[PDB]
């Protein structure tokens, strides 16, 4: 579909969650699971889950 960017800093709450800073972009792995999306960090190359409302679509 489209890439998404961070609006606010976020710290991983679980062992499977990813930490990021505002302005970080991500590639969507799966977004049909609700307000909780599966993504890949384009900056670190790691995989995990993060809250979808902390992001906004690019362009």
Curated annotation (Swiss-Prot):
Shown residues in whole-protein numbering: 85 to 142 of 534
Domain SH3: 2-59
Protein name according to UniProt: Tyrosine-protein kinase Fyn
Similarity annotation: Belongs to the protein kinase superfamily. Tyr protein kinase family. SRC subfamily.
Quaternary context: Associates through its SH3 domain, to the p85 subunit of phosphatidylinositol 3-kinase.
Location of this chain's protein in the cell: Cytoplasm; Nucleus; Cell membrane; Perikaryon
Domain of life: Eukaryota
Role description: Tyrosine-protein kinase implicated in the control of cell growth. Plays a role in the regulation of intracellular calcium levels. Required in brain development and mature brain function with important roles in the regulation of axon growth, axon guidance, and neurite extension. Role in CNTN1-mediated signaling.
Signal peptide residues on this chain, from the entry's feature table: none
């Amino acid at each position: 579909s489209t890439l998404f960017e961070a609006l606010y800093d976020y710290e991983a709450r679980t062992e499977d969650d990813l930490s990021f800073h505002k302005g970080e972009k991500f590639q969507i792995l799966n977004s049909s699971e609700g307000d909780w999306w599966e993504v890949r960090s384009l900056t670190t190359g790691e995989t995990g889950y993060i809250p979808s409302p902390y992001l906004a679509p690019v362009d």
